[model samples]
Structures are given as C-alpha cells and as structure tokens.
Target chain A: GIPLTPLFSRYKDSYLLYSFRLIDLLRASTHLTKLLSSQATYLYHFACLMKYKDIQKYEVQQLIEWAINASPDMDLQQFRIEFMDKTTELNLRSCQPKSFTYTFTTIWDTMHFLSLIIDDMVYTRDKSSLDFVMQQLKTMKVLFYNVFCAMCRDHYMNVKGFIIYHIELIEIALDKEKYGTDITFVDSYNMLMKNLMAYVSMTFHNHINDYKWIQRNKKPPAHYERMTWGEYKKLLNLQL
Target chain B: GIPLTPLFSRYKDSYLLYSFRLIDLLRASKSTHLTKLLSSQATYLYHFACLMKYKDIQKYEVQQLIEWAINASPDMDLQQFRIEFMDKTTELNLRSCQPKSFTYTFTTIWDTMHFLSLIIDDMVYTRDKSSLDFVMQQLKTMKVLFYNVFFILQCAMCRDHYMNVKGFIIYHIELIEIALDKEKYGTDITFVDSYNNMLMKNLMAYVSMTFHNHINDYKWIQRNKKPPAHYERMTWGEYKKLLNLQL
Candidate 1:
C-alpha cells in the first residue's frame, strides 16, 4: 500500500533494489510469505501509508527494526517474510497490463483516494477534527455532482441518489461524535465514500457531454433530435 | 467476650466477697468492655482469644504483667454481653430443675453436651482448647439438634433408654472418625476424628458402667399394677426424693 510514485520517484535505484530483495526474500521464506495472504497484512499496509504520507529511505528499515524489537515471544523471521510477500503482491497488482486510457484514470483516482484515507485516520483519533474532514469530503462531493449534472444530466440522476446517501452517512458520523459515540465508524464510512466517489468521477470523465441547451439569445438543437449524432459517433471522441 | 479468669482470678477474695466495685470497674473500663452488639461481639471475642494465645511470656511476673496489659477494643462490649447471655441459657436448659430424680441424669447429659460442643469449636478454629464460648449461640442448626435430642431422651423415655442413648451417641461419634475418607474430605477428617475420640473417652469416665447397666434393666411399672405387689416398685427412701409434689 506504499505509494509507488514517491518510492520510485524519490528513491529510484534504491526502490528497485528493495523491490528485488523483497521478491527474493519472499521466495526464500514460504512460511513467512503465507502470512501476507491474510486480510490483516493488506490493512496494515494501508494503515502505514495513511499514517506516514511520504515514504522515507528508513521507513521499511524502521519497520524491520520495530518488528525485531517487539517482544521476544513474537516470531520476527515470519513477520519479515510476510512484509516481503505483501510488498511483492502490491508490485504485481500495479504492473498488470491495462488500456492506456484506464491507466490514466486509475492514477488520478489513486491520488485522491490516498488523500481521503489520510483524512479518515485524522478523524478517528480526534473527534474535534471530524467537522473539518466532513466539510472537505462534502465540498468535493458537491463539486463532482455539479460536473456530472452539467455533462450527462440523465445518467447523473441515476447515480446521484447513491452519492447523496453517502453524504447523509458522513453527516451522521459528524453528529455521532457530538453525542460521545465511537469515532471509528467514520473511517469505514469515509473510506467506502472515497471509492464510490472516485468511481463516479472516473465514469463521468470518460464520456463526452451530448445534451442540447438554450443559452442567452441563441437557439440550440431541437428537443427530440439526435444529441451529438448518437452513441457510436460519440464513443470515438475523447472529449468530456 | 474477655476471658475474666486471668484478670479476676488474681483477686479471689474480691469475687468471693461479691464486691460490687470490682465488678463495675471490670465492666466500665473501655479496655474491658466492647460496644458492638449481637453476632459481631461473639466474633470479636473469639478473635480476641486468638490474639491472646499468641503472646509469649517466659519470665516470672511476665504472665501477670501480660494479663494486666491485655486490652481489647471498646467496640466489642455488646459482643461480650451476647456471649454471656447465650452461655447462661444453654447451661440452665441442660440442668432441667423441675424433676428431682432427673438431676443426676441432667448433669450427665450436660457433660456430654458440653464435650461435643468443645470438640466442635476445636475442629473449626484449629486451636487445642475446650470452650463452649459465645460463638455456640451462633451455631444455628447444630445447637437446635443438641437441645432437641437431650429433651426427648431425658423426659419421654425410662431411665434405661436415656443411659443407652448417651452411650450410643458416644459410640457413633467414634464411628464417624474411622469411616472418614481423607482425600475426598481433606485433612479436616483427621482433626474431627481426634476431637470425637477425646470427647468419648472423657464421657466414658464421667458416667460409671454399674449405674448405667442398672438404669437400662429397670422397667417402668404399668398403671394397673398395685405398688405393694409390684416388683418394679420404688422403695420409700427412693420415693422421698419426689416428696415435695402434691401428687
């Protein structure tokens, strides 16, 4: 779950070297590698990325040191093998072949997705910070809703209901904190909201706007006529 | 309850003369009197006795000095009164004063009763001492059973059954010791067994065998039998013991 960009961009050669060592270590230790198959390993990776924004040269090294320094009762060798396997699994998922158009969309989605998760972690620890984080997610959602409405007004109506439902859930999360309820639920709600909004934003951006409009003193396309020459023709264009 | 023996025994003349001043001082001092009433006072008295037993005195005047220095909480006075009241009740009931011929029988019954209670106390506290202390009043079901058995055998039965029942009770107390399964019941079985054995031995010595056998053979005379012709008739000297009665 460590961001591939900073690891590759900042630590370039060292990142590649770490990747090789990680793969090699995973292959050597099968018992330790099996630990990475668990859901906890993935969640732990995501927690680390959300907790520490930019990857440091000593980030993986510190993790290694901490694992070794944990209680003598714990098995360090198996933990190292799990870390190697998880890192290798993430590397494979990032490198899988996909359409260039889809790849570009994924990059943009991941950028905002990681930022939202960071806000979720902040909200969990401090109930007072819930209002600010709720506001930011709400602002982004309203902006996305407006863009979708202006482009595919009919299609936006269908998905808008789902998006608005999530907005109400976030509002509830903010209210719950005032009543002295648990704040952990906010992280789960925000994380799901991020994925749904990212998917909607991606879907809306992929298509071109094809509706007729009357503005000022100018007359637009007839109400019943083909908008942008129908579907097949619109599919060939990359404009939104 | 403070054990008055060591404190008052030093002034034998004072007690013999029935000096009221000595009794008031013994009753008044905060060290001598405890204030808490009911069962709590009984528990305090037992605890106080336990504390006194542990204090050591090797020198000549050390023992007397220790008794003078002995102090208990004033909060325990009510407890002291309760213990005294319970002891008086138990002793009076066992004496059974109305029937003149039954007085010796009552004394034997009281001795056996006192012996069992003393053993029961030693069993609970692990202390090697005989005392039917104030705590006896608190022994709910057991105390009731003891009084009930004593009344039925002494009043309802002829002298024969009364003597046999006491003997049988002593024999049964020994049997409980031998039939004990140690592992299942723990080390308590051994202590209880020893306590019962000691009680029965003391009881056998107190009630002589010849009197015991004679009481068992003596049958009650039926109402229809004329006193002069009846072999079961009591002699005139024996009948005099019941002379005070109008009948």
Candidate 2:
C-alpha cells in the first residue's frame, strides 16, 4: 500500500543525501544529554537533529514568507490544529480510530499513493496540477494526524521525531505552488517526496536492526561468574 | 484489488503499459479507431479518423482525407497496410479493439475519479456497505451484449458527438480556474467533485453505448456493404445548408 519499493530504493541509493550539518549538531547534543551510547537512542536523537536542518530549507523559508505576506489571513497553526481535529472525529464520516499498526499501514499506503500519483502527474503532465496535488497533501496530513492523534504516540514522536517535520516540509513545498516559483519542478517535487519518505523508512528499519542486534548479542555475566576466584577456595573442595 | 476493467484502468495499470524498458511501459499512448468491419473503407477511415482529430481539421476536410485513404482505386485493393482490425469482443473488453480515442481516454480518467471517490469516500476511508460492491456491479453492467453494443464516437451520427467533445475540452479550462482558487486548492472545489461526477457519468455511459453500437453497425456494414454516417459529396448549396448549422 505504501510506496515501499521506491521508499526502500531511495534509502538504499541516497543514504548520504541526509542533512550533514544538523547531524553534526545532533552528534554533539546527543552526547551532552548523556544519552547512553546505543543505536536506539541515536535513532531518536538523529531524527530531532533534522529539525535544525529544516530551518534552513528554501521551501520552508519561502512559505514562512507567504504566511507573513500573501496568505496573511490563513493561520497555519490554526489550520494545522483544525486539520489535527479531523483525525479525532470523522467530520461527517464514519471512520474510527484504528490500531497503531492499521494506522501505520494506512499512512504508508496513502503516502505511496501520493508517490505513485506524482509519476502520473509527471507522465500525463496534468498530474502536475499543483492545486490537486495540494488536495492530496491535505488529505494525507489529517489522516496521519489521525495516527498522530490515534494509536501511535512514542513510536512516531520519539523514533520518528524528525519525520513530522519532513511532512511539514512537504506541505511547505506543495503550498508554494500557489504563491511560489518557476512551476517546472515536477521532477524536483517528486524527488523530494521519494527522499523524504526514504529517510523515515530507513530510520525505522535501522531502529529495528539495532533492537534486534541487542537481543541476539547477549552480554556476558562475567562478574557473576568470576567472583574473586570462587571465594578464595572457601568452597573449593565442593567444586565438581 | 478491485480488478477494475479498462474503465477503471489505464495504460499504466496493465503490464501492457510496462513495455520493454520497464520505463516505456508506463507512458500513456493516445490513439483512436472506429467501427468493427475489417474492410479497406473501414480501415482507411479508422486510421484517418484519429490523425485528423489532431490536425488543422474540420469535419468537411476530414471527410476528404477519409475519402482518399479509402479510395485510391489501384493501391487500396492492390496493397494493404491497415490489417490488424478484428473482432475482439468478449464481455466489455474495455475498448480492446479501438484505438486510444479522446472519447475513451477521457472516459477512462473520468470513470477513474468515480471509482476512487466511491473507494476513498466510502469503502477505504469511511467504510460503507454496498457502496463498493454495488457500484462495481452496477458499473460493470456496461458489458457488450450480443443484442447490440456500440468511438470519436459519442454517436458521430449526431455530428454533435464530435462537436460536443469541444465541451469536454472546455471543462478542462475550468479545471485550471478551480485549481488556483482552491489554492491549497481542491476538488469539487471546482466542478471536479461536484458537477464532474454528474458530467462524467453521463459522458461515460454515452461513449460506452455509442462505442458498442458503432461496433455493431460496422459489422452490419461489412455484411451489407453500406456505411453509416456516409461522407458523400453534397450538391453545391445543400453542403452550405449543413454548414449553416455550423454558424
């Protein structure tokens, strides 16, 4: 349902395409916080680091200007809040809050649909109709906010802290079409989606691998075993 | 999962779109054909039809282009190029034999929006009973019938069918307007969600019926050697009478 193949592929090919400078900031802050030297901890912290990176985005910066200049009437925070409100209630719909796994899969499938649709847009050339593209984004946004509001809390908030911002960045990108640029970035736009989701997928998988690694590589109980040469021969005769 | 027919499918949905390069498979190819009779006149008109649909053409001139392509006395009988035309009918083959006409492709796309809305609005997002299955069942009712079935044909006999495609072209213009006003723009925000569902449903059925009927008529032509919507040369003033309708 999710654009899994493309997500997986972008992670494979573009791993190094991540934001480097913010990752450096995370490298230092993670240690200062005295977080244990573990992969799971690193995954959580690395995700947050991207926020620092997000501040420097050309897209976000442009939209922030729009919020200030042109779309002055549309309060983004209020828009997001009301949008978040949809996740909780169906808004003339009958959908209910599903399980964390169900919500996760729905979000994936929905995003993949967006991904698949970009291919359609670029191909037909009409799929480039950014207005409808924004429709799709807004649709997915509330739904994910459903997940954000519904089943998953720590999983996305902690493990995917970097991701909500990724979604936010995409919104900024699509929103720009209304008040924005050369309007020829159909290819560029699609690439942004692929790579953004790719990182989320990769980081999620990386967290899994690290968790699994700890399980399989059990630490030795050497201190319990050595015990000062078995209590200095006090029970040496009883050893069998 | 719905196993949608070509009505709900497009060049990309089937492996047919995924031609050799794997990439080439996904490109949308727009083409068209008409009637069912596999004859020189049928072939010449079928091939000539869509190409002229592209050119600086009027109905009167397209008449002439089809005129030469079907006639050329020695060569059309002596040589043959358009021969793949055949009977492929088998219960709603999704215009399997027709070329990719604007009529069919727009039908494909417009119907797709219907399928999606029914899906996301009811089945997938909201979860409703009878909506998905009933709609699919009702939609599937357009299957080719042995009784009759029917291309550039919304009933080209009406001359209005060819002429009315201009309306669909006009509808697309409205899409751009709505595309902006809705800005973080939207659906049915333009006629997309509202009137389109109504319009496409009407056009969808219209094209399907016409396509089926046209096929049947062509077979009749093949049997009887007569043509429907015959492009015969008119006497001087009478041609102007038809042109009078144009004004």
Candidate 3:
C-alpha cells in the first residue's frame, strides 16, 4: 500500500530512541544521597521522559511539592519568564559584555552621581524598616539556583509532551497501538534498545541471559560501558 | 527447503505471458491470404501461428531454434516428420489455455489448428489440383516476403541469441531454397532427432531452474550506499525500525 524502500542493515534505530547515556548516567554518577548535586542533569532528562510520556501526574506531585518550597517567594512563573528571557538574551548576546566592563562603568557612573551630591541630599529615609534589603539579594543565590533547575526540568516536560503528541500520529500508522502508544516514548525507546540487544545477541548467539551473573561477575570494568545496551541493561538491571 | 524471501505474487506472471499471447494469436488469426494481404504487419506473426502449429505444437528454446527448424526440414512426408518430432516439434500447451467448448460452443487452437492443418495437409494428397496452386500461391507470397530482405546470421552472447529480422527471414529463405531447388541438405533424416532430446533437456534447466521463488535476503553488513531521494540518512537504530527488508 505504501511505496516501500529497502531497509539497510546499518541503521538500527532512530532519534525516537532516548539517549543511552541518560540510562548510563545514573549508574556512572555517584550512588545516591548527594541528592541536589550530580542528579540535576539526570533529573532534567527524566523530566522530559516523564512529561512526554503524558503521565506527568506523577511528575506534577513532585513538581507541586518541590516548587512550593523552591518558589517560596517570587512567583516562579513570572520569575522564570524574566529569568528565561534574560538568559535567552544572554544565550544569544554577541555584544552584551567584555568581562566586567559593564559593571566597571556602572560603578563609575555611580561615583559621578555621588560626587554630584546625590547621596547626601537623598538621605531622606527613616529607620528604613530594618532594612536587610541591602544584602537580601545576595542571600537569594541558592533560591534562584533551585528555581533555575526546576524551570529547566519543566521545560523537558514541555518538550517531551510536544514530541509524543506528534509521534503518536505515525505511531498509529506503524500499528504499534496495541502497546496503547500513549505516553510511551519509553516503550518505543525500550523496543529499540531491546531490538538492538537482540541483534547483538546474535553475536553471542544470545545465550548469555544471566543479569545477576554478568553485572556482578562481568569482565574488566574498563569496557563496562562498552557492552551493548541490552548486555549493559541486563548487567545493570536497567528497566523503564 | 530453503526459507525464501517473500515473492510478490504478481511479478511472476508477466514473464510467463508471452506463451499465452502466442496461443491467443493462433486462436484468432485464421486468415486466408487476401485477408492476410489486406490487413497487417501482423502476417509474419500470423504466418508463424500457422507455421508453428506444425501439427499442434511448437515453441522453441534459445540455442535450439535453428537446430530444430533445420531438423524439421529435409525430411520426406513432411507431416510424418511432424508426428515424430519429439525431436523439438514439441507440443505447446495451447490446449492448456483451452476454454471449454460451448453449445454456445468453442473449438480450441488444437481443434482449429487440427482443422486448418489437416485440410492444408490434405492438399499434399490433393484429390484435385486447383487449390494446390492456391497453397502454392500462398506459400510463394510468403516466400517473396521472407526474401524481401536478406537476414544475417547473428551470434549474440549468453547463447541467448535472437534474430528479430534475422531468423524470420533465415527460415523462409531456406524454405525457399528447398522449394526453389531440390529440397534440403540431406535426403533422409533420423539421428538429427537424437540430439534434439538432449539439446532441449539442456534448456529445461535454463528455463525452470533459473526461475524460482527464492533469494538470499540475509544481509551481513551495511545498507544501501545510495538510497532513494526521500530517504535521509538515519541512525542505525532508526532504520532498523523503519526499513523494509528484501531479497
């Protein structure tokens, strides 16, 4: 029915496949407890995966609680708009800065203003309402940082949702619907990985089915990452 | 026992259809001369229908064409030579294409060719000589047309020779040489029929054995070096899912 073309042997998978590195990162990175540390990158990728899977409910709860404390003050939706805007600009700014040059000139401008008697003449303030406002912005560093990471995570949810919606158009055509094809890039990615592994299993005649023995009793750790995703998954206990 | 690739069912039919056409031509064109002269460039093919119905069958092999035409010639009692030509005057399955006769009735190519050839052959034992001149008149018309141009003997490779303008005239010219003179190369014929069986047996392999519904689709490495324009280069993983396999 469709005009078909010959399949080549080399192209084993498509971009519909999520990065294997994402799966491997959890293992290769530190084993846990350093929660806020190295986990941020994986968190972002996982956010995309989950968000796109269309079952972001599990994620919304995480998002809901995390954002409450994470965005205790400046309404995050507005802050992200501003932050992402400036960062988006900064991301593209060819003429924005030369080291601290803009900062250097701003201080110079401020000195000229004080010299013009502005500081003395403008000292019309009462007790300033116990102003910690002077240094409050400096103290806000980690607050902003937490907001930034969470915003990045939310983005993948946006991205993944967009991808899966469109991918469903052809997923139906491919007759992959019995899997329900709903929110299942994970399923697609898994099929790809498993098929790739099966192809490699042809290499060993696929006989080595022991996950426990292989990972615990695997050969040199030097090539540990070098094994097939299936072999690595088997040894690594990788699952969706 | 080999696991063959999928054979697209329609692909095999086109090549086998020429024989069907040959039968169809025989079924239709029962022209009697001026009908031949009045209508077509098709007379050669038409004459060939009447020609190869040697008694009720003929289709030749590639290397065996000249040998059989030559074999069928040079014998006495030409119709007897036709009878014994297991020798390459082999029967075609024109009857295989036979649609049953109706009462509302029909006669097959065999029924028709039998009717056509017997009376035509009967002219050989002509009770009356008038239509004998007519068969002679019809054959002479064919003779001049075949000799209208000289056909070269050609040799092409693969022993897969063909003579479009070439072999058609080559046969009739010989038919003329026999008529224009004292018959052909030998006065009698038998052993030429000997190699006839062995020669076309060599052909049975070339036909059916060369044709089969199997092929090797087990690819060991790599994909198309140049694929269709709609194809953009995709990753090994993407193509693994999207690609269509072939033999």
Best-first order by lDDT: 1, 2, 3
Global Cα lDDT for candidate 1: 0.32
State the lDDT of candidate 3 residue by residue for B41-155, as single tens digits. 2233224343433332233331232233333334344344434433332343232222122111111221222222222223322223333334444434443332221111222
Candidate 2 C-alpha lDDT tens digits along A69-163: 33324443453343234422422111111221223344444433333333333223333575665554444343333223422342333223233
State the lDDT of candidate 1 residue by residue for B27-46, as single tens digits: 33454233122122222222
Say which prediction, candidate 2 or candidate 3, comes out ahead on TM-score.
2
Instruction: Show where candidate 1 strays beyond 4 Å.
Output: A1-125, A149-153, A186-240, B1-247
What does the interface RMSD come to for each candidate? Answer: 47.5, 24.7, 33.9
Interface RMSD of 2: 24.7
**Residue A24, model 1: Cα distance from true site in angstroms:** 47
Against the reference, the lDDT scores of all candidates come to: 0.32, 0.30, 0.26
lDDT of 2 by residue, B135-218 (tens): 223222211110111222244443422221222222222222222222221222212222221122122223323332333333
TM-score, every prediction = 0.19, 0.20, 0.15
Model 3 accuracy (lDDT, Cα): 0.26
Q: Which ten residues in a row have the lowest lDDT in candidate 3 chain B?
A: B212-221
* Candidate closest to the true structure, highest TM-score: 2
Docking category of candidate 1: incorrect
